[PDB]
């Protein structure tokens, strides 16, 4: 299909994120690369006004699943690639277990050659010295399933998932994700029956970057289909 041919190779991606925690306003920047044939992603964010406001891996999920390798037996199953390149919102609430709450919205399309991701993030309710607006995250990700179903009144998908973001404490904090995701143009895409995304995540600095910022290397891949 078109949509899928648009991922064959190395498609080069840019994020733009602006953010509103608790009245803190921030800007990021994101740049790189994925590679669905791999499932595989490379990124690079700058926050662009200063010190993020919260800490950088609550924003993971927030900065693509286009890129996810779906094996080709379930190729029918690929909501994603389908809706390109016209793209599709992706909108969640992210509800942080005993603190404040984010909601996102954000399109997904190509804009020429590019594969553009631009969230609005509004959070609200947050304890001022809890474990966001205090940073007592450890700088770390671990591997979640995102468990995909069809929302076929709005020709796309829900998601449903809790990251887990382990606590300098040695505590862990849920971020419990609701994602609708809907296509941006009015044809049909590909509704899947449910599966999940294997993501996998690790966070990392440029030692030579002197802005506050994250690299993050990602890997995507279907499953739950056998
Ligand atoms: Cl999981």
Redesign the pocket.
Known sequence: SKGEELFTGVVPILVELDGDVNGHKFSVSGEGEGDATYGKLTLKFICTTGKLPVPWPTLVTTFVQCFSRYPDHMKRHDFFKSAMPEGYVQERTISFKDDGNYKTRAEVKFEGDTLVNRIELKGIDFKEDGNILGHKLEYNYN???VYITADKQKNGIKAN??I?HNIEDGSVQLADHYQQNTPIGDGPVLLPDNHYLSHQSALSKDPNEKRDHMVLLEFVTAAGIT
Do not use: A, I
């Open positions: 591997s979640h399933n998932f809790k887990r």
